[PDB]
């Protein structure tokens, strides 16, 4: 038999973990014990960039990553996660399957040994804070935690906070101690992490839509039989249908949940946020050397 190893930043009890253990089970059942999936959550193997690097070198088998996170290796791919360019999961998924998307996926595999088998919806990122965020000006001087990603940095920068990069494991503490005033993430993680206990405000900023690609190492993939490949692809699709699905349900419920935990929810006017991004889009086209902004936004 073959036991494949998957690493993730998400912790047990997250929507990401429940799907991978569900994924573990499905392969574990449909393969009659011949494909096993060992899980290494909570970033014990490193962050997604480190785990992506392990896949490229053949040291780790499976990992999660967003399609825009592929910009670490294929710069044009960062465009899909540019703030507010992507409207919804359907728009983002259309990018993933477009000729542009297939081009990135071909380059991922055969320069970097990454097989994107599917991509799931993980939610639209909102902004939490210890003070209310009614307008674009409530961001001025806000110490906003962001991840270890340029476009989250740009979002914070262009609405006017001073961004603070921080690893996903350290965030709850920086909010509890008010070492940082706010952070930005999708709602299902905001609860699972219990970000809301230490956060008094929820600022519906809808600034970035996150996907949740399942990537297998290409060197591991060619090591499987054709029968195993089908079980995996389709099992992955099995959990992805559910996972994407679970997220939409929660994002529909949890805004009310946070209210019931005394969270103040603010729907600020987004037009100045979208306007603040125009110089960023222009510049990105120039940095790639070819326009892709206008193409992606129109998909």
């Amino acid at each position: 038999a073959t036991t494949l190893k998957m690493g993730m930043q998400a912790s047990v009890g997250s929507v990401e973990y429940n799907s991978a253990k569900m994924l573990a089970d499905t392969l574990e059942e449909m393969s009659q014990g011949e494909i096993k999936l060992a899980l290494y959550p909570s970033a014990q193997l490193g962050d997604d960039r480190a785990m992506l690097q392990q896949l490229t070198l053949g040291d780790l088998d499976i990992t999660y990553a967003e399609f825009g996170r592929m910009g670490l290796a294929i710069p044009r791919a960062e465009a899909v996660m540019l703030p507010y360019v992507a409207k919804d999961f359907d728009h983002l998924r259309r990018m993933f399957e477009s000729d542009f998307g297939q081009g990135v996926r071909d380059e991922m595999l055969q320069k970097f040994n990454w097989r994107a088998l599917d991509t799931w919806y993980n939610g639209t990122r909102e902004t939490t804070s210890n003070r209310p965020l009614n307008s674009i000006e409530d961001f001025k001087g806000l110490k906003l935690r962001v991840p270890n990603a340029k476009q989250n940095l740009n979002y914070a920068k262009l609405s006017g906070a001073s961004p603070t990069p921080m690893s996903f494991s350290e965030v709850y503490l920086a909010l509890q101690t008010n070492a940082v005033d706010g952070q930005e993430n999708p709602l299902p993680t905001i609860k699972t992490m219990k970000f809301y206990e230490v956060q008094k405000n929820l600022a519906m900023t809808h600034h970035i839509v996150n996907d949740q690609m399942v990537i297998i190492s290409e060197s591991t993939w060619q090591k499987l039989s054709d029968t195993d490949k089908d079980i995996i692809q389709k099992a992955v699709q099995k959990v992805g249908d559910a996972h994407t699905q679970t997220v939409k349900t929660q994002e529909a419920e949890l805004v009310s949940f946070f209210k019931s935990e005394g969270i103040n929810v603010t729907y600020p006017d987004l037009e100045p946020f979208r306007e603040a991004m125009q110089p960023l889009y222009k510049e990105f086209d120039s940095n790639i050397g070819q326009p892709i902004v206008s193409k992606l936004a129109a998909m």
Partner: nanobody
Amino acid sequence: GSQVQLVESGGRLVQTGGSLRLSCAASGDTFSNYVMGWFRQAPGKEREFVAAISWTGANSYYADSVAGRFTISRDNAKNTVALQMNSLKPEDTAIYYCAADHFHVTHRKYDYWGQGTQVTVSS
């Protein structure tokens, strides 16, 4: 997109047991986006990987040929990568190449390359 331009320096004539520090200056695209690598080639011979360093310097990779003697480091403020070579022997004689890629890779070329600097180790 925008690519990286690399220029190595430091190449010299040195003695057996001597130490030499190579440096590579990077320009163009953002230096912190790239894993920086050092490679060496003798007349003929297939590219030889020597060392590489991750974006933040947290990971380093080395060839068994140099694992104890050579040290790679980077400076993301000055946009440079350096290779400290110690206990050189004449078989270390080569053109040493600075290379950049978004990730450390072994199945292929690095994407971007410098012009090389010649190191001669005398017996």
